[PDB]
Write an enzyme that holds these catalytic residues in place. Structure first.
Site, PDB file in Angstrom:
ATOM      1  N   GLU A 175       0.624  -0.785  -0.067  1.00  0.00           N
ATOM      2  CA  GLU A 175       0.159  -0.010  -0.468  1.00  0.00           C
ATOM      3  C   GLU A 175       0.792   1.160  -0.193  1.00  0.00           C
ATOM      4  O   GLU A 175       0.389   1.803   0.287  1.00  0.00           O
ATOM      5  CB  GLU A 175      -0.761  -0.278   1.245  1.00  0.00           C
ATOM      6  CG  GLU A 175      -2.208  -0.413   0.985  1.00  0.00           C
ATOM      7  CD  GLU A 175      -2.738  -1.262  -0.229  1.00  0.00           C
ATOM      8  OE1 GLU A 175      -2.987  -0.488  -0.834  1.00  0.00           O
ATOM      9  OE2 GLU A 175      -3.566  -1.956  -0.281  1.00  0.00           O
ATOM     10  N   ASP A 177      -1.054  -3.532  -9.731  1.00  0.00           N
ATOM     11  CA  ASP A 177      -1.805  -4.483  -9.203  1.00  0.00           C
ATOM     12  C   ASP A 177      -2.071  -5.637 -10.327  1.00  0.00           C
ATOM     13  O   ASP A 177      -2.433  -4.960 -11.523  1.00  0.00           O
ATOM     14  CB  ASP A 177      -3.575  -3.870  -8.663  1.00  0.00           C
ATOM     15  CG  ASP A 177      -3.036  -4.011  -7.586  1.00  0.00           C
ATOM     16  OD1 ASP A 177      -3.046  -2.733  -6.606  1.00  0.00           O
ATOM     17  OD2 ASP A 177      -3.947  -3.652  -6.426  1.00  0.00           O
TER      18      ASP A 177
END
Ligand SMILES: [Ca+2]
Length: 636
Positions: free
Chosen positions: A123, A214
């Protein structure tokens, strides 16, 4: 002139607790096709990161995939990038755990035939001291966003080179992910990236543009499989990107073996831009979004984005008390279990980040991700000798009381209605109060009518043994939604307490406000039993008044699509097979029982998420002057 260097990377993660089909879909929709297509282009280089649980699911189910990864590693097509094995946010876990977590994944990468030197920052939560930790793990570089550098003070034009950053006299290299590339790849047409990259060339041969995002974007997110594979975006990209003579493909390690970082820079606590929005308390996030949108409407976002700031990730612990409680409980156990390898593995698993916050993906809002964290905190603690203790667990300046026996761990908050905020079963490894109150999110207010009529926001935190006072004529719907008239002031107010063998005695000198303040007193004796707890109540009103005293018990019922319901009962049972299992509430006197699911409206990557975070059960007893009863919670 000089060629522009290009680094291509993906990040594949599946949180502990995800449904089996979710891993299966992610694999057939993205992980597999992406690598199968990668094998068709011998010159394509990719920097990939796989989270530990994912690699384990793959070992057990798709062994052949790993041989494929070994093969691609061997032909110089893949650099394996690591992080903490269970995807924890490094900055949010003990430094000692950081080492073990990273080393576990380095061991796995090693088994694939690669010596990992880089870390994908989970993150992208950066904190200066992470330099020490990463360095002790033998990591030479970490991947972050260009936004981190902009927050430090640099302009986008000087972010096409990695930089050094230091702390404790130790340094580590840092690569910035180009936000533009995240926009272009892989949703915009291929030639758009080729155009953007070609325009970056210059007289500096070390210049480089980084794309890292991602892997789920390449197939899982709705509509992406058709776009990326059926319509062939990926094959068209791999072909173009490996042919272009102005674009030089390389892995992070390759880049570092040929060029040295541009210089030294210091970074603030930050994450990728989008996080600035979510990590803010509801009210401010709305403002933040307004500011950002009003910057694009006045076409002045691009030249002024470098100065836009929002929240920081750690403050999710402020936004969501339940997450903070969960987090501090795990920090507590991690320390006490640090020397027991078997117990510790459970606490490391509990550090999986997803359930601790909420951005766009459900995260903390998904009960199955939350119970997984609790499940692991409980299993790690079960190894310790039970011991009662008074201490401030969630750091709000008001000590908690932790009573525990061989089968349970209960956490009581005297300051908040003297309720039980945690009732953890060591046998089922579940927290009966693993619930979430209903709160407004900045993205609320388009919501359909069916869900709209069921929407309600709480003013009360939700626990076990919450003392109410309502009017006899009050209805369930009023109560279900947050309309009803709360007459007492015992739900969210402090209680005095006295420690007793196997429990606690609490009482509060409050009052029942209606037409006048009728001073009242609530006394509750809570004791742990080998199969739950028993609470002896004694309510006393200084003067006569016809009302209904209510004891509320919230439960993390997750696999029982319950609906509003009221009934007379002396004892009743709950059966939640996929959640808290079987439990029974026994009273020593019949009562009016109000039951309703705690419904939350959540944002996800694929539409709205209207989830039942639990069910509220509140036993009503009529009172006019004196009241006495007993409530027993039983684990079956
Ligand atoms: Ca506290």
């Amino acid at each position: 002139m000089e060629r522009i260097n290009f680094i291509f990377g993906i990040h594949n993660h599946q949180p502990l607790g995800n449904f089996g089909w979710v891993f299966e879909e992610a694999y057939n929709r993205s992980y597999r096709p992406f690598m199968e297509i990668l094998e068709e282009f011998p010159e394509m280089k990719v920097n990939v990161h796989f989270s530990g649980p994912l690699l384990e699911w793959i070992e057990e189910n798709k062994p052949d995939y790993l041989d494929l990864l070994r093969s691609l590693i061997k032909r110089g097509q893949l650099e394996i990038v690591v992080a903490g094995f269970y995807e924890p946010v490094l900055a949010a876990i003990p430094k000692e755990d950081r080492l073990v977590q990273i080393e576990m994944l380095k061991d796995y990468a090693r088994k694939l035939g690669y010596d990992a030197k880089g870390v994908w920052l989970t993150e992208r939560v950066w904190q200066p001291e992470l330099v020490k930790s990463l360095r002790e793990a033998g990591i030479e570089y970490v991947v972050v966003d260009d936004y981190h550098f902009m927050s430090a003070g640099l302009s986008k034009e000087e972010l096409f080179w990695p930089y050094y950053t230091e702390d404790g006299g130790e340094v580590i290299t840092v690569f910035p992910i180009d936000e533009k590339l995240r926009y272009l790849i892989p949703f915009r047409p291929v030639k758009k990236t080729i155009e953007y990259l070609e325009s970056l060339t210059s007289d500096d041969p070390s210049k480089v543009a980084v794309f890292h995002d991602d892997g789920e974007k390449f197939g899982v997110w709705p509509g992406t499989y058709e776009w990326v594979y059926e319509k062939g975006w990926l094959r068209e990209f791999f072909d173009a990107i490996t042919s272009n003579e102005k674009i030089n493909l390389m892995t992070y390690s390759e880049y570092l073996s040929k060029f040295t970082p541009r210089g030294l820079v210091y970074l603030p606590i930050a994450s990728y831009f989008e996080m600035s929005e979510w990590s803010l308390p509801a009210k401010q996030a709305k403002l933040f979004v307004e500011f950002v949108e009003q910057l694009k409407e006045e076409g002045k976002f691009e030249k002024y984005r470098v100065f836009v700031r929002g929240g920081i990730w750690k403050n999710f612990f402020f936004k969501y008390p339940e997450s903070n409680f969960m987090h501090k409980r795990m920090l507590m156990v991690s320390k006490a279990v640090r020397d027991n390898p078997e117990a510790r593995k459970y606490i490391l698993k509990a550090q999986c980040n997803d359930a601790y916050w909420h951005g766009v993906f459900g995260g903390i809002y998904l009960p199955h991700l939350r119970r997984t964290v609790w499940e692991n905190i409980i299993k790690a603690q079960r190894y310790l000798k039970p011991e009662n203790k008074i201490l401030d667990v969630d750091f709000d300046g008001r000590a908690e009381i932790m009573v525990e026996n061989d089968g349970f761990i209960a956490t009581i908050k005297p300051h908040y209605g003297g309720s039980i905020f945690e009732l953890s079963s060591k046998r089922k490894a579940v927290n009966y109060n693993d619930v979430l109150p209903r709160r407004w999110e900045h993205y609320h207010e388009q919501i359909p009518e069916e869900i709209r009529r069921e929407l309600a926001y709480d003013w009360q935190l939700r626990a076990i043994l919450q003392d109410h006072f309502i009017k006899p004529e009050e209805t369930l719907d009023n109560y279900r939604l947050v309309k009803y008239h709360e007459l007492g002031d015992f739900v969210n107010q402090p209680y005095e307490y006295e420690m007793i063998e196997n429990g606690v005695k609490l009482w509060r000198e409050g009052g029942v406000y209606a037409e006048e303040k009728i001073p009242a007193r609530v006394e509750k004796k809570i004791e742990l039993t080998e199969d739950g707890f028993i609470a002896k109540y004694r309510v006393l009103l200084e003067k006569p008044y016809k009302a209904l005293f209510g004891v509320e018990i919230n439960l993390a019922v997750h696999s029982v699509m319950e609906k509003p319901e009221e009934f007379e009962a002396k004892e009743f049972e709950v059966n939640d097979p996929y959640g808290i299992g079987k439990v029974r509430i026994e009273l020593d006197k019949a009562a009016k029982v109000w039951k309703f699911p705690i419904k939350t409206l959540s944002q996800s990557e694929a539409g709205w998420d209207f989830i039942q975070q639990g069910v509220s059960y509140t036993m009503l007893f009529p009172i006019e002057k004196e009241l006495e009863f007993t409530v027993r919670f039983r684990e079956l």
